[PDB]
Scaffold this active site. Structure first.
Site, short mmCIF file in Angstrom:
data_model
loop_
_atom_site.label_atom_id
_atom_site.label_comp_id
_atom_site.label_asym_id
_atom_site.label_seq_id
_atom_site.Cartn_x
_atom_site.Cartn_y
_atom_site.Cartn_z
N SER A 13 0.87 -1.19 0.00
CA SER A 13 0.00 0.00 0.00
C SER A 13 0.89 1.22 0.00
O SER A 13 1.74 1.35 -0.89
CB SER A 13 -0.94 -0.14 1.19
OG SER A 13 -1.56 1.09 1.43
N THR A 14 0.81 2.10 0.98
CA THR A 14 1.62 3.30 1.09
C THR A 14 3.13 3.04 1.09
O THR A 14 3.67 2.35 1.95
CB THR A 14 1.22 4.06 2.38
OG1 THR A 14 -0.21 4.11 2.42
CG2 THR A 14 1.83 5.45 2.39
N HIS A 39 -2.43 -1.25 -3.49
CA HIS A 39 -3.58 -0.35 -3.28
C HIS A 39 -3.37 0.94 -4.09
O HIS A 39 -2.36 1.63 -3.92
CB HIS A 39 -3.70 -0.01 -1.79
CG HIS A 39 -4.17 -1.12 -0.90
ND1 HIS A 39 -4.19 -1.00 0.47
CD2 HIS A 39 -4.66 -2.36 -1.19
CE1 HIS A 39 -4.66 -2.12 1.00
NE2 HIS A 39 -4.95 -2.96 0.02
N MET A 132 -0.54 0.74 4.98
CA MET A 132 -1.43 1.05 6.08
C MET A 132 -2.54 0.03 6.19
O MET A 132 -3.10 -0.42 5.18
CB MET A 132 -2.01 2.44 5.75
CG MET A 132 -3.01 3.03 6.73
SD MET A 132 -2.29 3.33 8.36
CE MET A 132 -3.79 3.38 9.35
N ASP A 135 -5.18 -5.19 5.57
CA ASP A 135 -5.46 -5.97 4.37
C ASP A 135 -4.24 -6.86 4.09
O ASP A 135 -3.09 -6.38 4.08
CB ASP A 135 -5.77 -5.04 3.19
CG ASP A 135 -6.34 -5.76 1.99
OD1 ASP A 135 -6.92 -6.86 2.13
OD2 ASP A 135 -6.24 -5.23 0.87
#
Length: 198
Positions: A13-14, A39, A132, A135
């Site tokens: 993600s991030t 993501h 973050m 998931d």
């Protein structure tokens, strides 16, 4: 090279775009297939695939429903759609679906990981990078319980230590490694034991 077809599944993600680029650069054309759920918005996933394709040796593309999962390729889940690994007979394939978001994400890392656990079992390596939320944690535990080797990016190298932290806390991580050692570790473990033909 390997007596069995293996693959690597990655979730991020991030901070993931730079992390994923770092992990994929060293792979040559003979590498196992890499399937990734990052993501990001729809459209961005097509752009990211193209950006990576220009820098990597392997072919990088936004995944398409039903295509075969090939060695020397990296598949990026399309934004706002879920990506799963599937199997039609003798071939591993991409399955794209519009099911509901999981953990408030689509594509979802858990959706990817659960499908790899079901279809690849111990013939896969699961990797969870900077990001973050949670998931991917439950999905990784499923892979770990299916016998796959699982790797989590460490705290020192993460932009956001959420996703890997959650994965670790769920009890589904075989080992925690620094970003600079992930490609080496996933590749060594995927080819260990009797994997290499001799």
């Amino acid at each position: 090279l390997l007596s069995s077809e293996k693959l690597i599944a990655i979730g991020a993600s991030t901070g993931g775009t730079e992390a994923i680029r770092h992990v994929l650069q060293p792979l040559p054309l003979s590498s196992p297939a890499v399937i990734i759920t990052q993501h990001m918005p729809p459209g961005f996933t097509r752009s990211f695939a193209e950006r990576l394709n220009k820098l990597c040796q392997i072919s990088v593309k936004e995944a398409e429903d039903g295509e075969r999962v090939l060695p020397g390729h990296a598949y990026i889940a399309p934004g706002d759609k879920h990506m799963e690994l599937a199997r039609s007979g003798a071939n591993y394939q991409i399955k794209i679906h519009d099911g509901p978001p999981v953990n408030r994400h689509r594509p979802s890392v858990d959706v990817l990981f659960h499908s790899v656990a079901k279809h690849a079992g111990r013939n896969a390596v699961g990797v969870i990078l900077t990001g973050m939320g949670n998931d991917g944690a439950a999905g990784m535990l499923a892979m770990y319980q299916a016998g796959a080797w699982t790797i989590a990016q460490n705290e020192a190298s993460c932009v956001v230590f959420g996703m890997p932290r959650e994965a670790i806390n769920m009890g589904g991580v075989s080992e925690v490694v620094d970003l600079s050692q992930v490609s080496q570790q996933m590749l060594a473990k995927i080819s260990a034991g009797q994997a290499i033909r001799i």
